[PDB]
Amino acid sequence: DYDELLKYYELHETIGTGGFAKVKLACHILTGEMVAIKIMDKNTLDLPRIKTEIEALKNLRHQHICQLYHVLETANKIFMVLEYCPGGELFDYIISQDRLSEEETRVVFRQIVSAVAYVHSQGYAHRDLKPENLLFDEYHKLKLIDFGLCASLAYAAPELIQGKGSEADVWSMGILLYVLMCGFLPFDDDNVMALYKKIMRGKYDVPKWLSPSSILLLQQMLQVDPKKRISMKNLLNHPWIMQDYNYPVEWQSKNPFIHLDDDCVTELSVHHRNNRQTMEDLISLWQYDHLTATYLLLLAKKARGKPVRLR
Numbered sequence: 254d255y256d257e258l259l260k261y262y263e264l265h266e267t268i269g270t271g272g273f274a275k276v277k278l279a280c281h282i283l284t285g286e287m288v289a290i291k292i293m294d295k296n297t298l299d300l301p302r303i304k305t306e307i308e309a310l311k312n313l314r315h316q317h318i319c320q321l322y323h324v325l326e327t328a329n330k331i332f333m334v335l336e337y338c339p340g341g342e343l344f345d346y347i348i349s350q351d352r353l354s355e356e357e358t359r360v361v362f363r364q365i366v367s368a369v370a371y372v373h374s375q376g377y378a379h380r381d382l383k384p385e386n387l388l389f390d391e392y393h394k395l396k397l398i399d400f401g402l403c404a405s406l407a408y409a410a411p412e413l414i415q416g417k418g419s420e421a422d423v424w425s426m427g428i429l430l431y432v433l434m435c436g437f438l439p440f441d442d443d444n445v446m447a448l449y450k451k452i453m454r455g456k457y458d459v460p461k462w463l464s465p466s467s468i469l470l471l472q473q474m475l476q477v478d479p480k481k482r483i484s485m486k487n488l489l490n491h492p493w494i495m496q497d498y499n500y501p502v503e504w505q506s507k508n509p510f511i512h513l514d515d516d517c518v519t520e521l522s523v524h525h526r527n528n529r530q531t532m533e534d535l536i537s538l539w540q541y542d543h544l545t546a547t548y549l550l551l552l553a554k555k556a557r558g559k560p561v562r563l564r
């Protein structure tokens with residue numbers, strides 16, 4: 254139940270619902286930082302989905318991946334405390350704009366490619382890429398979410414639906430690119446089997462406002478045969494991707510966990526009136542408990558150019 258969570262967080266409103274989970278806005282008491290808490294019920298659960306996401310996020314640390322802070326499991330519930338992104342979903346952003354210019358699309362799309370390339374570099378495929386799974390953070394940069402399916406029909410690759418992961422992610426990014434520049438899906442139908450057929454055929458409308466280079470890139474990402482599909486490697490430095498930037502997508506993590514931050518370690522030891530070495534030792538266990546949560550939220554203060562202070 255909520256007694257364990259309420260020790261550390263003030264709970265606010267529900268900001269999202271899923272089939273088996275909800276996400277609530279909350280504030281971390283010790284740091285005053287806003288967070289987003291994904292809440293699951295262990296009775297009405299699937300559960301492998303939760304464990305999959307948790308394991309992935311413990312191993313992924315990247316400027317375009319929504320950060321995990323804290324995992325709490327009670328008798329009845331599982332709580333995942335995640336980064337709060339105050340800019341909302343990419344999908345809702347596209348609808349409000351109708352569609353994005355090629356220029357703004359490229360700004361956003363390069364961030365998606367950065368995240369997904371990194372995910373692949375760490376040995377995973379996301380498998381559920383869609384604009385509902387991309388959020389805008391405090392600096393209006395994109396953060397990828399929902400790793401429950403890592404190793405929706407409108408975004409699934411032909412070979413994935415066929416049951417015949419890396420290439421499947423490229424296809425989904427092709428659908429995303431189309432939606433960004435067009436404001437609607439390339440394959441859509443009320444009838445699910447009719448949608449399946451359309452995806453298998455691979456034919457789609459090419460709107461009048463797409464540039465020849467955009468058209469070519471969509472063609473290369475939306476190849477029905479995954480062997481003919483552009484590879485992640487060649488996506489990183491694609492001429493469309495390079496335009497106006499003149500350097501390939503920077504996919505490597507810019508915020509990896511190397512050494513513990515001295516300033517964060519000191520603030521925790523001072524606040525808790527604890528032996529510094531004991532504090533450094535307990536943080537290093539990386540249990541994703543309240544200690545880890547407080548440590549990581551202090552690091553976020555620092556990344557924001559703010560002082561590392563508690564209470």
Ligand SMILES: Cn1cc(Br)cc1C(=O)Nc1[nH]nc2c1CN(C(=O)N[C@H](CN1CCCC1)c1ccccc1)C21CC1
Pocket residue numbers: 268269270271272274275276289290291319335336337338339340341342385386388398399
């Ligand atoms: C929608 N919105 C509007 C504003 Br302003 C901020 C947000 C917002 O969602 N912020 C936010 N920050 N961090 C998170 C979110 C939403 N959020 C989510 O994880 N949201 C997903 C959203 N889905 C995509 C397809 C269906 C479910 C979710 C997953 C399970 C249950 C409910 C929601 C995270 C927790 C990591």
